[PDB]
């Protein structure tokens, strides 16, 4: 139907540049202003600027003056946002959005592109067990899990028993540690009886580092 299609996630050092693309599909690309709006994790939306794909004219929030360049290729109906001299605090999901009318009603949105900016370098996580024991059992329920630690950048995926186990699974949002490395926990609650009869294994996948780890989680002895 009618769509905005954005390029994939980016990972950048400070001082690098990033160029994010936004392809318009199903409507006249030159007929509408395209805007860029960004969102830092856990924060609100921040408008960056617009481009007129017909004329090439651009207008930027003052904050990004000198660092942002918006461009278009009418031949492939694609808008681009390039942000240079990147700062760690440019870490955000970057959305393109279509201005439907002079209301600036943004009716059509791209799915967003994550841009991570850090002095950190790519690193696979260390996966440690969160062993079930008497201190993680009550009322016939046992909790267990995996600690996925010191990885960069986002994201990682975690499954349990190759995806056979889905109920009671909580995979928490990662935290950015004081090291600039991410750490997250994935836990599952199970009938405590099954600790004696079932093997539990977390399957951790960190594609940016091509790391795949399976960790058996044994009850503490």
């Amino acid at each position: 139907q009618v769509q905005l299609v954005q390029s994939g996630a980016e990972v950048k050092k400070p001082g690098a540049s990033v160029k994010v693309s936004c392809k318009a599909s199903g409507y006249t690309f030159t007929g509408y202003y395209m805007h860029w709006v960004r969102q830092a994790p856990g924060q609100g939306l921040e408008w960056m600027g617009w481009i007129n794909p017909n004329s090439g004219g651009t207008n930027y929030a003052q904050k990004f003056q000198g660092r942002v360049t918006m461009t278009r290729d009418t031949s492939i109906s694609t808008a681009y946002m390039e942000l240079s001299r990147l700062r760690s605090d440019d870490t955000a999901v970057y959305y393109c959005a279509r201005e439907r009318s002079d209301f600036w009603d943004f009716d059509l949105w791209g799915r967003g592109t994550l841009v991570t900016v850090s002095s950190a370098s790519t690193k696979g996580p260390s996966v440690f067990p969160l062993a079930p024991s008497s201190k993680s059992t009550s009322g016939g329920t046992a909790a267990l899990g995996c600690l996925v630690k010191d990885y960069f950048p986002e994201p990682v995926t975690v499954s349990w028993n190759s995806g056979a186990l889905t109920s009671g699974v909580h995979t928490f949002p990662a935290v950015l540690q004081s090291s600039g490395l991410y750490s997250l926990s994935s836990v599952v609650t199970v009938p405590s009886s099954s600790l004696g009869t079932q093997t539990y294994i977390c399957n951790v996948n960190h594609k940016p580092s091509n790391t795949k780890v399976d960790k058996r989680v044994e009850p503490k002895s």
Partner: protein, 207 residues
């Protein structure tokens, strides 16, 4: 120029009427739009030009206002409405209002996990406290080592409100070096929550 939204967050029950207010610091326009952003998703246009319902959006959503004072209403809150809502006037975007579903108070189940031998051998110890399936979101986790309150030492993370049972879960990690870890004996996390009569302490003795 600043856009203000009130309240910053709210809880309401299914079937409740929810009203969110947006105020411009100074006059901008009568043109104001409202967006809904669900966790993990792009913002979605719900109301345009103050009061017009976007085509295909359920009729329980509405908006009103002019000048500098605007409101957004969900007539009858539904489970699928959990999201953050934003007002906007041109370049100016409000800080957002998070809406979650109000349910019966649920006390968390509190669990604690010692560091693994694998991690210790690598020189670090992480102790994890898990609070499971609680409501409301507000909760307090503080770590005690030999009964000394910790600070600058831990981070926590909270899930999105669960779709089937409307609860939250919270994971907190205390981290320190193995050398530091082995200095002390008792590791405890002390949990405070509306559903708990008094704080709950979950703890273990190293070795």
């Amino acid at each position: 120029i600043q856009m203000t939204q009130s309240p910053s967050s709210l809880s309401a029950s299914v079937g409740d009427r929810v009203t969110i207010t947006c105020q411009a610091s100074q006059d901008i326009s009568n043109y104001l739009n409202w967006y809904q952003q669900k966790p993990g998703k792009a913002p979605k246009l719900l109301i345009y030009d103050a009061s017009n319902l976007e085509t295909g959006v359920p009729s329980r959503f509405s908006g009103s206002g002019s000048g500098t004072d605007f409101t957004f209403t969900i007539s009858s809150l539904q489970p699928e409405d959990i999201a953050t809502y934003y007002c906007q006037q041109y370049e100016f975007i409000g800080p957002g209002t998070k809406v979650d579903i109000k349910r019966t108070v649920a006390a968390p189940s509190v669990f604690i996990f010692p560091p693994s031998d694998e991690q210790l051998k690598s020189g670090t110890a992480s102790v994890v406290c898990l609070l499971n399936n609680f409501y409301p979101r507000e909760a307090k986790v503080q770590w005690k080592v030999d009964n000394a309150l910790q600070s600058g030492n831990s981070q926590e993370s909270v899930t999105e409100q669960d779709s089937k049972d409307s609860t939250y879960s919270l994971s907190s990690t205390l981290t320190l070096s193995k050398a530091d870890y082995e200095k002390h004996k008792v590791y405890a996390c002390e949990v405070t929550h509306q559903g708990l009569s008094s704080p709950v302490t979950k703890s273990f003795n190293r070795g």
